[PDB]
Design a protein around this nucleic acid. Structure first.
Ligand SMILES: Nc1nc2c(ncn2[C@H]2C[C@H](O)[C@@H](COP(=O)(O)CP(=O)(O)OP(=O)(O)O)O2)c(=O)[nH]1
Ligand SMILES: [Mg+2]
Ligand code: NA
Ligand code: NA
Ligand code: NA
Length: 316
DNA sequence: CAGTAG
DNA sequence: CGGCCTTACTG
DNA sequence: GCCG
């Protein structure tokens, strides 16, 4: 458990401020700093003590000091008054920092303003209409029901189709921001020509209420379980050939920061990691390299010279 | 392509 | 100094 | 932001 909440709680505000304003790299710096402070072992108390920590340098250590000596972060007192609004706006699925800034420059300050006067993409309109629902994390139990709803509908076409809920669900979280379902078939071919039909079925069943993104093997949409007391939830589905199962599973289980770190490691070792496969002899890109055999997730860690980590231990 | 997202 | 993951979808 |  986090031993420096008195520190992170302050930094998160600043990290979020930079994020919504578009300074993504700086925000990344803060995010990683925060992840460190959190996954630490004992409440930090010294400057030199902070600096040592990977992900914390002079400037960050200085800020962690001001927090422990004054219990305050003067920087927080100078956050632009546009931030709360930029955050409100970018919390609409489909709208990022650029759109939020544009809307802000156009004079908009509330979702009422967005609704009545802003230009909205099809995705943003859907994000807006489910604004409150998409900000909520659902109980794990509900995520199971959604997974089962997809698996059932899928297996109705081919009982052999393998369906696994990945993301935060597979990492064992108590609550889930959405549901991520990976679909493949051990026969290495039956997975083809199903996606479309699956969506139609789920749609005719009234389960899928809106689509956000629909690609060849990737679907991002909105669903809602039957009955009263149900809210709309985000649902992501990916269909992959069995030969890419391990890497697809690894990718879709995350976390995002874990994936980025793992991919970064692969890069330093002349390799390349994607949801498709782990490649070696990659000429940085410029050279495709060779695809390494990875039957299971453990193989990927092995080939990268890493101790296997259970899904629950992949927060970053 | 830029923006957004997983 | 300059990357900070990689691929995919939208329009 | 941090780090090589
Ligand atoms: N490489 C990479 N993988 C990513 C990224 N973002 C997501 N993934 C992978 C890893 C991530 O686990 C998975 C699903 O992403 P969500 O569903 O959006 C976030 P989840 O972890 O499920 O937790 P939730 O907040 O939903 O409860 O896609 C990214 O930027 N990069
Ligand atoms: Mg998820
Ligand atoms: Na958004
Ligand atoms: Na997701
Ligand atoms: Na992302």
């Amino acid at each position: 458990t986090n031993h420096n909440l008195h520190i992170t709680e302050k930094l998160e505000v600043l990290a979020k401020a930079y994020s919504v304003q578009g300074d993504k790299w700086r925000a990344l710096g803060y995010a990683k700093a925060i992840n460190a402070l959190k996954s630490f072992h004992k409440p930090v108390t010294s400057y030199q003590e902070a600096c040592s920590i990977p992900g914390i340098g002079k400037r960050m250590a200085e800020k962690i000091i001001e927090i422990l000596e004054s219990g305050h972060l003067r920087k927080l007192d100078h956050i632009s008054e546009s931030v709360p609004v930029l955050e409100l706006f970018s919390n609409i699925w489909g709208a990022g920092t650029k759109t939020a800034q544009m809307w802000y420059q156009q004079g908009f300050r509330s979702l009422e303003d967005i609704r009545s006067q802003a230009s909205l993409t099809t995705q943003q309109a859907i994000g807006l209409k489910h604004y409150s629902d998409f900000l909520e994390r659902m109980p794990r139990e509900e995520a199971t029901e959604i997974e089962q709803t997809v698996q059932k509908a899928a297996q109705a076409f081919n009982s052999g189709l393998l369906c696994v809920a990945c993301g935060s669900y597979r990492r064992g979280k108590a609550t889930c921001g959405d549901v991520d379902v990976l679909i493949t078939h051990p026969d290495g071919r039956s997975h083809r020509g199903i996606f479309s039909r699956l969506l139609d079925s789920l749609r005719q069943e009234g389960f899928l209420t809106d689509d956000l993104v629909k690609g060849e093997t990737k679907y991002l949409g909105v669903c809602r379980l039957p009955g009263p007391g149900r809210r709309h939830r985000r649902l992501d589905i990916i269909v992959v050939p069995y030969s890419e199962f391990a890497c697809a599973l690894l990718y879709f289980t995350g976390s995002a920061h874990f994936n980025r770190s793992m991919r970064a490691l692969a890069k330093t070792k002349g390799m390349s990691l994607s949801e498709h496969a782990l490649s070696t002899a990659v000429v940085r890109k410029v050279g495709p390299g060779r695809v390494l055999p990875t039957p299971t997730e453990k193989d990927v860690f092995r080939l990268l010279g890493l101790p296997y980590r259970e899904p629950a231990e992949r927060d970053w």
